[PDB]
Design a protein around this ligand. Structure first.
Ligand SMILES: *[C@@H]1O[C@H](CO)[C@@H](O)[C@H](O)[C@H]1NC(=O)CCCCCCC(C)C
Ligand SMILES: *[C@@H]1O[C@H](CO)[C@@H](O)[C@H](O)[C@H]1NC(C)=O
Ligand SMILES: *[C@H]1O[C@H](CO)[C@@H](O)[C@H](O)[C@@H]1O
Lengths: 79, 7
């Protein structure tokens, strides 16, 4: 299946993934198309901050879906 | 504090 990653810049990027690929694999697929470090990406979808270790199927993300690439928010919980 | 996170 194919998904889309819309960003703050407003540039939609066409990614080609599989139901088995983990979220982190998706983030890394962007590092191959653009060069953006995966450790600096935060994919938002359906008002949810998608976790790294979890496939697409877990989120029921269906064909032709659109995610949001924002920048990782430095948490304030911890210290 | 004295450890990290982030939780
Ligand atoms: C810890 O993270 C907070 C944000 O979540 C910051 O506001 C805070 O200033 C940070 N304190 C730090 O000390 C960051 C790490 C500094 C280097 C620590 C090196 C270790 C001790 C080897
Ligand atoms: C801190 O942990 C929170 C947990 O909600 C996370 O959202 C955030 O990305 C983390 N910040 C880091 C790893 O700097
Ligand atoms: C944040 O809170 C958790 C609670 O289990 C701690 O385990 C962690 O070390 C930190 O204090």
């Amino acid at each position: 299946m194919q998904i889309f990653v819309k960003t703050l810049t407003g540039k939609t990027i066409t990614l080609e993934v599989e139901p088995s690929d983990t979220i982190e694999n998706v983030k890394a697929k962007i590092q191959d198309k653009e060069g953006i470090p995966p450790d600096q990406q935060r994919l938002i979808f359906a008002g949810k901050q998608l976790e790294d270790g979890r496939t697409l199927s877990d989120y029921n993300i269906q064909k032709e879906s659109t995610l949001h690439l924002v920048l990782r928010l430095r948490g304030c919980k911890x210290x | 504090x004295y450890x990290x996170x982030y939780x």
